[PDB]
Amino acid sequence: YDNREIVMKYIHYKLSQRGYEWDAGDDVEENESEVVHLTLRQAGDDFSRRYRRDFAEMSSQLHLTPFTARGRFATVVEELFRDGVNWGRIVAFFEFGGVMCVESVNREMSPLVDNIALWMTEYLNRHLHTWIQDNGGWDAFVELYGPSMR
Ligand SMILES: O=C(NS(=O)(=O)c1ccc(NCC2CCOCC2)c([N+](=O)[O-])c1)c1ccc(N2CCC3(CC2)CC(N2CCC[C@H]2c2ccccc2C2CC2)C3)cc1Oc1cnc2[nH]ccc2c1
Known part of the structure; x- marks a missing residue:
């Protein structure tokens, strides 16, 4: 998958x-x-x-x-991420980036959206990718938190 x-x-x-x-x-x-x-x-x-x-x-x-x-x-x-990485903190990271983008548009600061997307991509690539791959990848995220019976 492409981050x-x-x-x-x-x-x-x-x-x-x-x-x-x-x-x-x-x-x-x-x-x-x-x-x-x-x-x-x-x-x-x-x-x-x-x-x-x-x-x-x-x-x-x-x-x-x-x-x-x-x-x-x-x-x-x-x-x-001070205490390390897990799936819930990765979800929190996405939701936070989304809040930043929504607020940027709401506050007449829409150019920031492109910057935020870059910062998120770079952060994921530099800090989160090894953990993600070592923990089964996004497929494991889907197995845990998708529509399958828990
Ligand atoms: O449980 C955690 N991690 S988990 O891996 O076990 C797991 C559990 C469940 C799920 N999914 C279930 C869904 C699936 C779909 O179907 C419906 C069931 C998943 N996931 O999907 O990945 C993973 C977990 C880790 C950390 C954390 N923290 C919350 C407080 C802070 C630390 C992290 C402190 C707070 N910061 C303090 C200052 C700034 C603020 C902050 C920072 C960034 C973003 C937001 C915020 C503010 C709070 C708003 C963030 C809360 C957690 O709880 C939850 C509870 N339920 C959640 N649901 C989806 C994610 C999820 C996480």
């Missing part, structure tokens, strides 16, 4: 469900990966429900600006 594609499709779906058409994502949508994208969306929606009130507070705490957005992303993701 950039996972990031792009996740962000694009999250934005499109708010009525924002992200052109980079529009061209991504035009090109069993679908089960991975779907399962990640479902897991992220479940995470955001479990943490709904904390997410509302975070949206108030992001303090997004063009010149500090990268540092906000860096601070949050470093703290999220």
Whole structure:
């Protein structure tokens, strides 16, 4: 699976469900990966429900600006992974990136979406890929958290 594609499709779906058409994502949508994208969306929606009130507070705490957005992303993701990697923290990472993109559009800072997608792709490639592959890959994520009987 292509980790950039996972990031792009996740962000694009999250934005499109708010009525924002992200052109980079529009061209991504035009090109069993679908089960991975779907399962990640479902897991992220479940995470955001479990943490709904904390997410509302975070949206108030992001303090997004063009010149500090990268540092906000860096601070949050470093703290999220301080105790190591697992599937739930990977889902949290995706949902956080999605919140950052939604907030960027809502605050008239839409260019940041492209930057956030890059930061997420690079973070996944540099920090999360070894763990993912050592733990059965995205196929193992789907087996654990997809539609199969638990
Ligand atoms: O359980 C965890 N990890 S797991 O591997 O066992 C597992 C369990 C279940 C699932 N799936 C079940 C779905 C499948 C679909 O069908 C329906 C059932 C999955 N997964 O799908 O991968 C994996 C787990 C790890 C860490 C964590 N943490 C929450 C608090 C923080 C640490 C991590 C602290 C908080 N930060 C503090 C400051 C900033 C804030 C922050 C940072 C980043 C993002 C958000 C936030 C704020 C909270 C909002 C994040 C919470 C966890 O709990 C959940 C509970 N349910 C979840 N559901 C989907 C993910 C999920 C995670």
